[PDB]
Amino acid sequence: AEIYNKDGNKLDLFGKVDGLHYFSDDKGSDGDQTYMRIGFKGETQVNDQLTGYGQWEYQIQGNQTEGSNDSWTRVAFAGLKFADAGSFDYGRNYGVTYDVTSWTDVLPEFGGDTYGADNFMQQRGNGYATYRNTDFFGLVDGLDFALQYQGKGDGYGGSLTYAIGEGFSVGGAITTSKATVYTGGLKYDANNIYLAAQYSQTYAQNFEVVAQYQFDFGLRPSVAYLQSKGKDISNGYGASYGDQDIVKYVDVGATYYFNKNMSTYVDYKINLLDKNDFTRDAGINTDDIVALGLVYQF
Amino acid sequence: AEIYNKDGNKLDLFGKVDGLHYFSDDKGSDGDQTYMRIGFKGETQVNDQLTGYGQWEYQIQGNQTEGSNDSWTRVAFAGLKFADAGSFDYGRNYGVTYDVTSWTDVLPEFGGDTYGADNFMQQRGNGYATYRNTDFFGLVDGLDFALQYQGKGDGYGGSLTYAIGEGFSVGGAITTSKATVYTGGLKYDANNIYLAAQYSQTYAQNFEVVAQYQFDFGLRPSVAYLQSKGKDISNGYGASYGDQDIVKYVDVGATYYFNKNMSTYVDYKINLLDKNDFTRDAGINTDDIVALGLVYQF
Amino acid sequence: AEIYNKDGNKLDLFGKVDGLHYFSDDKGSDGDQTYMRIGFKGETQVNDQLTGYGQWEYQIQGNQTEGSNDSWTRVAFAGLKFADAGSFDYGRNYGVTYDVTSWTDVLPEFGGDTYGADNFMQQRGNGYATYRNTDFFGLVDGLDFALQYQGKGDGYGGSLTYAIGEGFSVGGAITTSKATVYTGGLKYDANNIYLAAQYSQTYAQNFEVVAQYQFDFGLRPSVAYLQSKGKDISNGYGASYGDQDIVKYVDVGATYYFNKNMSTYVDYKINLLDKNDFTRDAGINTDDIVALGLVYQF
């Protein structure tokens, strides 16, 4: 919801109350988790050439009872934007590994999650300097790329998207922090068909694919699969764990789209993982789980 | 302040900074409680028939100091409205007992309080799935009902309102969670003349009644009274306390009304409870306490 | 961004994402500190005479990791406004000392800092009942006075600011909670030149001086300094810490405003404190540091 436009300065104030109640035999997941979101994108044209933007967004829960306050800044960054030189912006932002990893997180509820926020660059984090450049300096249309730097431990990364034509995105991203990661994804986008898959290796090799159709009265079914395997492991100081599977599941989900402002969705995580000494001490869940929600957004 | 309305999606954002310096002999109350609430109501017409909504207004303190943070989500939900088919909304929402109980929470400062928030659905809560139906299916003018449902522990209730005509309002509900508390009460609202009473017993009984008149220049005086009395009693694990009053007091008060957007108001709790083996440990305030401040809103 | 004006009720929503990267040899300093702030000014015209305003603005960190939350209400007060009798505003407000003390705090990033927040009335805090009078009952131009009163511990204070024609401003102020504190400052304000020096003494003496010049192509380059020397202090229940310096350093800085919504800045704090018995047992910093951020506001 754009709340202000005047003399080349525009502020969309966006956000939503998403209602949703997880079902499970798991008890760290059964319950109400209606959270909600606020955040604004800001903008200011300085000269025909640049723009000084700014962008924030925080989450805050609703399931937490009174007195208690489960809050946190999702993204919060300021930058600048020059004519066909692209843009730099430093703040709490997305790791530039997300650029490709993104295409697979699209599920109604249970997406990404083979990478985490503050998980050494693959997702969000703090202190990120970010130069991404769009339509390769105005000479190559449909080719984008970003070269990124991190705040503390110290890190770096790069990403290149490419819309090869049609809707076939192709994408790569490399990153390192002091632990590196590659990142390859290919998305199809066109005629209501969304087919995107992505995988990589780390310092430990994970995959994810997802396929949706967009029904016309407004309903986006989704079959999606993702996994992650590894190598040797270490409980804090010691404990030698062999090579097992981290998180692997098939997923059917459907979102219904009333209009922009209001969606409604059921999603069925069909879990695979087997209950063992791994998935006890680490406390990785093994139960297939299912969630319904009524989101209102603005 | 409805900040945006266009293409049948509105979004009133509302709030207030309400300053009040309590006064007391007690040190738990005596001091600055300058607090504030932001939030928004959001709408979206989907059809001739339905509109989706969503609403969130969470609290913050101006009394806590710098670094330390006292906030919590008062409400957060999203639901649908079908025309004459009532309205569903699940989430951090009000309780069904409150429908009826509310008519008594009209004091300048200290009203209701025979129930806290999260106090088993008599007020706010979490997981509160709800369907309310106004004007009874659009066949009876002014007889409205609710049947609600809670998250966990488990539960349910349901209210029936009726503006008998003129300015009267008879009111009733029951509720239950796994503790079952009922509700009876009346209100009268015609000629700046506000009269209202409510009470029920639980599983153990409490009552509240109030009277107000709205002055033409803008001064709504309120004398009001409420009390609670109890049966068998247990201090966490154990105890034998007998039957005593958990809270009973008479109230003078008078809100002044510059306009809608601004208010001043003096309220004087005239407590009756005597200092005893009850009000020492369980820590019930046994002091009469008097509040002074300025509510600015938008 | 004034977001509302209708029937003489205004509402100016502001905020800003100022992503800075602190450099130092410290480990509590060097790193990322993207903070951000929201805040609303409030307005409602009641008569020709009064217009009952209200303000608010809490902070929120963007460096704090996910799940964690670093917030605090900076100001949140409600007040009325009588034209030629002044303005009363009770709430989480600035202390009556800051009227003067302020003129020195204009440095790009670090400044003031001699007084803390909640630092016994010298700046921000809670419970402030405030009556300031502008243009002195409308009969003396170039003058303002204030006599404030705190909540709890108890206290009072006064202030007298006078822009003495041209661009010279004389500032005097006093506060006395039950330890006192005077305050004396001088600002010069005209042709692209700021010159502001101030000091005081508490129950313990401090001083701050700054001179910034406002360029024509944008860029206010700054030079500034401040020092605070005390008497006998004691660690909680003991320790005789002779006579030393809390903090003394010369500062250099430079904001570069692109326009009124975007700024870039560097701030080179040159610190002069030697590390000894004091700085080690009290967490006082011995290092000189560099600050580099990118404010965006609205």
Side-chain angles (χ1 to χ4, degrees), chain B residues 64-168 170-200 202-292:
Chain B
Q64 266 299 321
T65 49
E66 188 139 334
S68 216
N69 21 282
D70 249 292
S71 72
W72 53 89
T73 303
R74 262 179 26 90
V75 276
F77 56 81
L80 303 186
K81 230 100 140 181
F82 196 95
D84 290 72
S87 44
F88 175 97
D89 41 299
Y90 148 85
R92 181 79 161 114
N93 196 3
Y94 266 65
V96 78
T97 308
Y98 201 48
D99 309 330
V100 203
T101 321
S102 297
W103 309 342
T104 58
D105 190 5
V106 311
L107 281 84
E109 239 292 332
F110 344 82
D113 101 324
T114 74
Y115 53 133
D118 276 317
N119 236 213
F120 275 171
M121 101 182 302
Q122 300 147 33
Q123 164 152 311
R124 271 107 83 175
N126 297 263
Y128 289 29
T130 300
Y131 155 36
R132 216 155 328 185
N133 203 316
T134 170
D135 273 277
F136 206 108
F137 293 128
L139 104 150
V140 185
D141 279 318
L143 165 64
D144 322 52
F145 76 106
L147 58 158
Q148 184 178 323
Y149 179 66
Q150 288 152 263
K152 66 233 98 171
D154 260 77
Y156 132 97
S159 72
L160 259 313
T161 59
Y162 197 94
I164 317 180
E166 209 283 321
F168 286 13
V170 73
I174 73 306
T175 68
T176 50
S177 86
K178 313 305 141 206
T180 62
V181 64
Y182 317 90
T183 335
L186 320 147
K187 72 193 281 201
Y188 165 57
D189 224 2
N191 288 291
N192 323 76
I193 283 285
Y194 196 85
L195 308 163
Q198 178 270 322
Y199 98 99
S200 174
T202 119
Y203 190 48
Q205 200 153 39
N206 22 343
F207 158 86
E208 39 202 292
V209 74
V210 53
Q212 303 211 113
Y213 180 78
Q214 224 336 320
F215 263 58
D216 252 340
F217 59 75
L219 204 148
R220 200 151 73 181
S222 52
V223 268
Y225 164 89
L226 36 77
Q227 81 170 324
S228 53
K229 295 200 180 190
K231 77 285 190 223
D232 162 35
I233 322 173
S234 63
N235 200 55
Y237 286 67
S240 27
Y241 267 95
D243 291 10
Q244 290 214 156
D245 320 67
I246 295 135
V247 68
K248 78 153 187 180
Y249 74 88
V250 63
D251 192 65
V252 78
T255 46
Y256 186 95
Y257 277 120
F258 310 110
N259 43 62
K260 298 151 208 194
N261 294 235
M262 183 90 216
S263 347
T264 188
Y265 72 129
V266 72
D267 206 20
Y268 199 150
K269 201 178 184 201
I270 311 270
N271 206 18
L272 311 177
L273 280 205
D274 309 339
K275 312 228 167 214
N276 73 299
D277 277 325
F278 210 124
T279 68
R280 283 166 189 177
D281 333 315
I284 305 93
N285 187 26
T286 146
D287 280 353
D288 76 307
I289 65 176
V290 57
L292 163 159

Side-chain angles (χ1 to χ4, degrees), chain C residues 40-168 170-171:
Chain C
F40 72 66
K41 282 175 189 66
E43 277 274 79
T44 186
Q45 90 121 174
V46 195
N47 293 326
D48 276 324
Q49 316 290 131
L50 100 139
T51 295
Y53 66 131
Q55 207 181 293
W56 173 86
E57 107 177 59
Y58 93 128
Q59 187 153 306
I60 291 134
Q61 303 292 156
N63 50 276
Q64 272 304 322
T65 76
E66 188 144 340
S68 176
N69 30 297
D70 241 321
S71 59
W72 54 82
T73 326
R74 275 174 22 93
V75 282
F77 63 88
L80 297 183
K81 179 86 197 180
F82 203 87
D84 291 286
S87 61
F88 162 80
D89 40 54
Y90 166 75
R92 183 62 164 82
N93 206 354
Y94 273 75
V96 75
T97 313
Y98 204 53
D99 319 15
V100 185
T101 344
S102 46
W103 301 345
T104 57
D105 184 4
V106 272
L107 290 75
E109 236 302 56
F110 349 76
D113 109 297
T114 63
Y115 42 100
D118 267 289
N119 217 250
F120 274 15
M121 210 166 187
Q122 293 170 45
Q123 209 198 252
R124 283 129 72 209
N126 314 235
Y128 289 94
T130 307
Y131 174 146
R132 201 162 311 159
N133 187 294
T134 176
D135 257 351
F136 201 91
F137 298 99
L139 76 149
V140 183
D141 279 322
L143 170 64
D144 331 70
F145 90 91
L147 328 183
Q148 208 181 22
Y149 170 82
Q150 282 189 298
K152 60 227 72 162
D154 265 72
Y156 150 81
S159 65
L160 293 133
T161 64
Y162 198 114
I164 331 167
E166 199 272 323
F168 270 56
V170 75

Side-chain angles (χ1 to χ4, degrees), chain A residues 1 3 17 20-21 30 32 34 36 38 58 60-67 69 258-259 261-262 294 296 298, chain B residues 3-4 9 40 42-44 52-54 56 58 71-73 77-80 90 92 117-118 124 126-127 152:
Chain A
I3 224 157
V17 171
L20 121 176
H21 180 149
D30 185 35
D32 149 36
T34 55
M36 77 99 257
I38 318 119
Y58 116 130
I60 155 206
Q61 297 294 103
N63 50 261
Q64 270 316 323
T65 38
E66 208 126 333
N69 32 287
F258 293 78
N259 59 60
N261 298 290
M262 201 135 182
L294 191 79
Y296 167 60
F298 60 89
Chain B
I3 298 193
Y4 170 66
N9 339 311
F40 60 78
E43 260 197 23
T44 175
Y53 55 23
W56 165 99
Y58 107 126
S71 72
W72 53 89
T73 303
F77 56 81
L80 303 186
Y90 148 85
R92 181 79 161 114
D118 276 317
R124 271 107 83 175
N126 297 263
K152 66 233 98 171

Side-chain angles (χ1 to χ4, degrees), chain A residues 168 170-191:
Chain A
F168 274 11
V170 88
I174 57 289
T175 86
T176 85
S177 22
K178 323 300 133 186
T180 84
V181 55
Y182 303 89
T183 351
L186 340 163
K187 74 189 253 185
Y188 177 75
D189 215 340
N191 288 278

